[PDB]
Amino acid sequence: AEWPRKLRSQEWYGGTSRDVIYHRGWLKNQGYPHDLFDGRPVIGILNTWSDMTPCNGHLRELAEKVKAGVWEAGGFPLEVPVFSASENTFRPTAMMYRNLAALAVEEAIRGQPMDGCVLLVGCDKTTPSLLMGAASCDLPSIVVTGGPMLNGYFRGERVGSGTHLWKFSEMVKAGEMTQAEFLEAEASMSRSSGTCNTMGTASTMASMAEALGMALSGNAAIPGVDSRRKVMAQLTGRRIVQMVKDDLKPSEIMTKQAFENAIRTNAAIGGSTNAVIHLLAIAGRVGIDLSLDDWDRCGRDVPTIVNLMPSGKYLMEEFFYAGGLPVVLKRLGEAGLLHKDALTVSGETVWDEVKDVVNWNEDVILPAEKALTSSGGIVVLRGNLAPKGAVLKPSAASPHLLVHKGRAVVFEDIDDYKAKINDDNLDIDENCIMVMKNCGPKGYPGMAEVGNMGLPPKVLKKGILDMVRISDARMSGTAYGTVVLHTSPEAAVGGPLAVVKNGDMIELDVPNRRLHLDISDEELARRLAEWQPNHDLPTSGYAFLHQQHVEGADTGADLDFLKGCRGNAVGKDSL
Amino acid sequence: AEWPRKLRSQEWYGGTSRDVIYHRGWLKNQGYPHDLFDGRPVIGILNTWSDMTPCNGHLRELAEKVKAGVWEAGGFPLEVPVFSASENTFRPTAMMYRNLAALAVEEAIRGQPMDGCVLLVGCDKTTPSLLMGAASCDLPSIVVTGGPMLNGYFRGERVGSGTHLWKFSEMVKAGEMTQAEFLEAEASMSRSSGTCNTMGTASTMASMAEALGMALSGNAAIPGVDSRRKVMAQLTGRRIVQMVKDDLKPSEIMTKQAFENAIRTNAAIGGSTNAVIHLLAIAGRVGIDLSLDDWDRCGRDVPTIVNLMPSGKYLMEEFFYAGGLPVVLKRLGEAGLLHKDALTVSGETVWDEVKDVVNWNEDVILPAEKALTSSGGIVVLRGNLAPKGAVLKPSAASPHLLVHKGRAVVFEDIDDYKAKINDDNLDIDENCIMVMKNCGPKGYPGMAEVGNMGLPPKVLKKGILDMVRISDARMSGTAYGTVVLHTSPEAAVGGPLAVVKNGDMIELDVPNRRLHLDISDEELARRLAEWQPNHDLPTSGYAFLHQQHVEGADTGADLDFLKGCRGNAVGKDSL
Amino acid sequence: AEWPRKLRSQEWYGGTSRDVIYHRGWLKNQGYPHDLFDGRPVIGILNTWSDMTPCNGHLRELAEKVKAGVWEAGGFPLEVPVFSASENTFRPTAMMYRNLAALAVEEAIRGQPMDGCVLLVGCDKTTPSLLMGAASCDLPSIVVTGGPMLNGYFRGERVGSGTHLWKFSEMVKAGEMTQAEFLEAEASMSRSSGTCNTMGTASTMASMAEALGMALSGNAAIPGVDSRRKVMAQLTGRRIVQMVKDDLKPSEIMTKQAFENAIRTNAAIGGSTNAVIHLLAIAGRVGIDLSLDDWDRCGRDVPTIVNLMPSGKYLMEEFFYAGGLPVVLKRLGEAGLLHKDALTVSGETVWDEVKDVVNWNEDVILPAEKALTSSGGIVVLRGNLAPKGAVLKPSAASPHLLVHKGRAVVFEDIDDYKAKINDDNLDIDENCIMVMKNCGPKGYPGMAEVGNMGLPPKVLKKGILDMVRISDARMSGTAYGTVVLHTSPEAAVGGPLAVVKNGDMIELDVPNRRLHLDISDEELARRLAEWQPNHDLPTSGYAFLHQQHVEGADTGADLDFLKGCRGNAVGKDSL
Ligand code: FES
Ligand code: FES
Ligand code: FES
Ligand SMILES: [Mg+2]
Ligand SMILES: [Mg+2]
Ligand SMILES: [Mg+2]
């Protein structure tokens, strides 16, 4: 596009009408030179900082670095806080507030005199909520990630965010650790400012951001407190001004190719199962046709080569010193698995960004023959038990359980699980299949990370730590096990998983992508004909709104009316 | 000056040596793009903010604005706290520490990789101490003034910072007010963030710096919380980068013409007497030839026209709304009393910055025919009693006492004064002459603002509020009365003032600039013969340093070994 | 100590006089409830933060954490920036300004209404300068250390702060490495906020302050960006308030035993040679008699068990995770080498603080029988060549060189060596004694860190990296080799070292603490008798102050008029 030209902020700040004396005159009450309003690019810095989002606790400092970049680059920077859907404070689950955050972000961008956006995110759900909202305006935008925490440690041994909460609490159930030992691990578990240091949802959506092209190369793995995270922020501030002038919009970056790059990247890094739901959501805002079948297709025969927990051994620091995601993207290109000419916010293709990087540790970023799995992509299972799809993370499942048939042990909701799971009389053993209902988008409500249900203590004491588990919930990106997730449609809407009865037999078969309830079709229609809701039914509030409008996990669990891209047209004026 | 060129900051940050890797490499630990060390101007922003300098309490917010401007102009901003000699916390008196703060500032500038300086100041002694430090280096520098507080308000009346502290405290012991009522005025007295709102030292020094050309036009009177003060700071951050490229140095702005512009401006505004001391010290560092007589000469027949406490009626807000110092300066050029071609930090002559401005309240900036005084300049008296000079602020004195003769009532030090003044048995009437010694630079120590002695209560209860007062002390810029100050040599070093005796007659003659002790030259000669120095001289500490090196107030009371300009040659390196 | 009682801040802020109405009314312009002036402890938070002290980059965040603690404990926190003698910026050498900064710190304490102090330090010379300053007032004070940077890395390997600086630049001279390779490591060398991460001066002075009891247990090794740094700062804020109420003064803490504890801790951790100078300076302000001989006696037979560069293999991170200084202090006590009853700022004895900690890594905090050295204490050599003492750090020297005789190669000043060192025709071998003069306190001036002269490139290429080097300079605490330092008296004040000529025989016998010039008493007699002092002594500014008053390195290189403790009596009032 051509420059100079009238950007949308001049609808507020250019000219001489009483309307612009009002807008420009009132903002000057903070000491701004008059020429800031001359039509140079006005940059919104959307900031999800918050004392109650501790994973992003340093993003105010990151914001100052972005500002200096905009100043240098000739723009007018302005910081705008936005909804921070913090993973560790929000109950019933931060997943419930992702759409709300996206709503507020979209309105905050379109409603106000900003020409381009910088999106400062970190904790799990902040990255997709802000990308969803900016995609619905399609103004030039760029991601700055806060970064992982440093390695935690306990008893001279490496500890990873989340993954060891599962390990320790199971160990405690198995009699291999006391709750007091667990407590002492607390102080050194999260011990710098940043996001979970395993390959959880935070680290995955940072990789997805980088691999879509929405952040400068290297953005994903730089530790939160590392000097170069602040360099990257300043340089992002410089770039965005230039991006506005050129008019490099999100819709030119996140192409079908870009989404396929991010999908094969999730296989390579052992990405979290929530990337499936978020990438779908984000694509539904950009306007790209993207389905569960693209996920399954693209991740097939892509080895998981990044050696981090929960699938592997190390944490985010090692991955960063190994060279980070640009080394994964070079590999994907080297193996012919990359759209090399995808565009990035830098204005270079992904290949031209990464072509010359170096793997500094083949124990962290593995050679293709020593991968954790030769087909690392998440698998989509279908069948009468999950007619709209269900997913599993192969890089952290048990091989002997990937095909398995056992007797169903049913929990009607999460409170049903917590009541029975420790009962020593619970009729369950290691061959059984644990099934849980009503933990989906409408059922939980919010689709909580509870599908990685803990094992019966009496199985754990035989030294068995895995079992086939099925639910319509999610699990943490930090979790592991042979867990079948996102079962669609969810029970709370009369999907077949609502009618599963104890004793029923179920067949899992990953190679044939098959999830089967072994009852006749007559018995199924009969059970389903008697379905009813067995979950909470809100009468008002945002909970009501969510209950009425949230789609299923198989499409991204967006709100139906919030789908797609609504543009950035300035409204009528306010006076 | 050649641009581009290698600036002194490149001695630390330019090239590929082991030494440059150390220096550049370490600063980089804060997140700085490598191109910031490529030779752009590095701008040190010297901040006198401290939680214990309340008058300067908003300087952090101002420093951020200076940084923004620097980034804009393409320099490299680095904030650098420096000693803040707060007038209302430091005891025995901030004056003692003025030189200490100029020493620290001078070394902080030369010892580190600044190419130009920004001087963030406010409270009384911060302005002179930072200007003294920078003059001794002569790197491109520029001033940002903190700004005066809003008006105080007690019982619907205007209350002024300082001036009403003396008015109220004398009314208390006159029997016209109670301390209880004095205390009620407290919280509405100093009720915004900034300096004293009268025409005191901070308002005078702010004007001095503008009048010298060391600060952008309009700097002195903007209220501290007025949004146009932050605008001023941002524009100053832009322009310091350009002065470094151009090499606009302090020696080039503070010429002799500049200093006379300053002296004539001080008479026009009825400025603080401390302006005399501070300005002699500053010219002491630039190396300009400036003397007491220059002061008497230049303020002669310059009418005081700024109707502000303590000479006049209103406060700094009123001054700012009428037009601030630019009006005053223009009137000086219209009157033939301005060096119109003296150059300023802006690159323009002073006349060019002021010649078009508009006086918006002649009740505040008075026309010459209504001037508070016809000869507004501070006067210098000489005579056997002050061989090296004493000063008096006529625009806040009583005309009928400017020629007076009377009986000496003599106080040996400040304890003796406090011990005697309120004694109704003291032989004193309104026609006597109050004399105090041992309050000078070495005597007090530090030359405290105690020269405006309170009158004896019994005189005050006659409705009388002015008597002639002589001492070696200073007085606040906010004080008033017919007060003879800065008497040199001070008693502590054996000046004539030391041998004045109760009952001696003294003659004050201001038109003839005479201050005469009426005793025979043989009698004064022998009285001095028995003079002995003070006891309990400080044997160690800064107090020791000050006792050995401070000069008399007749020259600026700098330290003898700190006079002059030592330049800005980079030192040897530390490895 | 009685509580409640009148603290010294009430001299400014208690009661009803106009003097107090001025002090208290003016600070209230920043918005403080009246009751904050009720006499609760006013805590001065002395901050050495500065954009030009990048090693202390985060101390503003730490200051806020301290304030919060002071609020919680019921005090009135006020932050006061103070001189910041940044090692990586100041030139000629930050050591020149260590006393300047102590001067400022002292006056800012006694001159303002603070009842207690928190010292926020990091970079080498900040820790000692605020400790000297606070020692000369004796108000209750407590230290907060910034903390070290995270490990650096190059080519997947660990790089140490400063230590790898000397290492790499010597490999370039010996042909094993290019300047351009050197430059690549720079971006990953200093990669988080904090101090040098070897066992250098900052690490050592932080350890000395914990060893002294002047800082809370664990204070020393917590990295800058580690979340327990912020906890410690808030815990310190709480504690100082109580210290003021109890009146726990530094003279109560920094006892002879406490200094012994510090000297022995230095040996155990292989600390910097600069601790010898800084500890004596600090003792000179407290009034405790302490000598170079105390040093030699106390470190004898104390093995260095901390296996960090430059002496060992690892960095501060690993030291932190092994258990830090508490584990070291604990071991001294287990070996009978600890004053277990020395009292700390917490009101507990050191042994009571550390007696239960756990060594979490025997490779980093070694067992005695695996120590780097069995007698790790710094050694004090005497002899005709250093009649007043010289020092050497055994834990990082070559043992075959601790008893050696050789021909002297004499550089008369740092410019002399800089011109001679890389000339292949320089007559020198791996058995000569590199001697260099005129780098002492007065000579450099400021006693730069240059005693560890880079070897002759032709020797380095034979694969030799160590030679006996002797001077009156310091070296970096990150330095290694068989280096003799602080040779007293210095050459510039006519000490023997001044007169060595090439070819003189010098003997170094460390086990016998002897350093000998092999010439006749008469020939040395004659040599000195015709010695002239340096020409071009500085005649103004701080350089003159320094030339006139700095004592020798053998007493800590204070200024003579600053030694001792002048207390905290509030001065006369300013009005
Ligand atoms: S809890 Fe915030 S990233 Fe996991
Ligand atoms: S006390 Fe600060 S300007 Fe008067
Ligand atoms: S340069 Fe600051 S600790 Fe080394
Ligand atoms: Mg999550
Ligand atoms: Mg004053
Ligand atoms: Mg050092």
Numbering used by the authors:
A (entry chain D), B (entry chain A), C (entry chain B): 5 to 579
What does the paper say about this structure?
An L-arabinonate dehydratase from Rhizobium leguminosarum bv. trifolii catalyzes the rate-limiting step in the non-phosphorylative oxidative pathways, that is, converts sugar acid to 2-dehydro-3-deoxy sugar acid. A quaternary structure of RlArDHT is a homotetramer, and the active site is formed in the dimeric interface in a manner in which an N-terminal α-helix (particularly residues Arg22 − Trp30) and a C-terminus of one monomeric unit contribute to the formation of the active site of the partnering monomer. The last residue of the C-terminal tail, His579, participates in the formation of the substrate-binding cavity of the neighboring monomer.
To study the detailed effect of C-terminus mutation on the three-dimensional structure, the crystal structure of variant H579L with product analog 2-oxobutyrate was determined. Four polypeptide chains, or a tetramer, were observed in the asymmetric unit. The rotated Leu side chain also induces the conformational change of a nearby residue, Asp23, from the recognition helix. These subtle changes result in a larger substrate-binding cavity despite the almost interchangeable size of the residues His and Leu. The oxygen atom O1 of the carboxylate group at C1 position and the oxygen atom O3 of the carbonyl group at C2 of 2-oxobutyrate were both coordinated to the Mg2+. In addition to the 2-oxobutyrate ligand, the residues Glu91, Asp128, KCX129 (6N-carboxylysine), and Glu453 were coordinated to Mg2+, leading to octahedral coordination geometry.
